[PDB]
Amino acid sequence: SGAIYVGNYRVVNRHLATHNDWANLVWEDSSRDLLVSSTTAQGCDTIARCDCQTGVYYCSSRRKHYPVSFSKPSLIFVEASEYYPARYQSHLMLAVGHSEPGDCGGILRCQHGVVGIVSTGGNGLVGFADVRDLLWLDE
Numbered sequence: 731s732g733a734i735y736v737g738n739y740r741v742v743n744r745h746l747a748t749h750n751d752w753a754n755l756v757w758e759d760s761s762r763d764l765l766v767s768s769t770t771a772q773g774c775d776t777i778a779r780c781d782c783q784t785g786v787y788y789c790s791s792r793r794k795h796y797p798v799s800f801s802k803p804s805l806i807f808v809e810a811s812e813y814y815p816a817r818y819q820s821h822l823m824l825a826v827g828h829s830e831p832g833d834c835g836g837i838l839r840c841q842h843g844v845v846g847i848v849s850t851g852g853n854g855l856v857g858f859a860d861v862r863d864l865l866w867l868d869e
């Protein structure tokens with residue numbers, strides 16, 4: 731679990747969105763596993779606007795932050811699950827690091843701010859849904 735709170739927006743994994751997230755929907759994209767909903771209170775986070783490929787993510791299944799080298803956002807095949815049929819997930823960045831399904835929502839951060847959130851993983855990998863291209867989050 732986990733979310734990004736920026737301005738009057740809450741960014742979560744679309745597969746983990748609540749009834750409240752859907753009732754206050756701003757934008758969603760099943761192909762990115764992303765959902766953005768509106769909040770009344772101002773958010774704590776700021777978004778990186780960069781091309782960093784190194785960062786630090788929070789892994790709740792270890793209660794630890796880990797440094798990672800991650801790929802550029804891309805279309806990656808994701809095997810079927812309870813949440814989605816087998817498909818290509820876009821704007822996904824892969825890295826070697828520990829992750830378990832409950833780790834989705836953990837923030838990936840670089841020196842510039844929030845890069846994205848944990849969305850995929852398994853077998854020593856961790857996939858992050860990029861948010862750096864979502865410029866409208868800052869306005």
Ligand SMILES: NC(=O)[C@H]1CCCN(C(=O)[C@H]2CSc3ccccc32)C1
Binds near residue numbers: 813814829834848851
């Ligand atoms: N974005 C999706 O389609 C995901 C929906 C939940 C299941 N997905 C996974 O990759 C799991 C497998 S082991 C793991 C480890 C960290 C995170 C997720 C996962 C796919």
Ligand SMILES: [Zn+2]
Binds near residue numbers: 781840
């Ligand atoms: Zn950066």
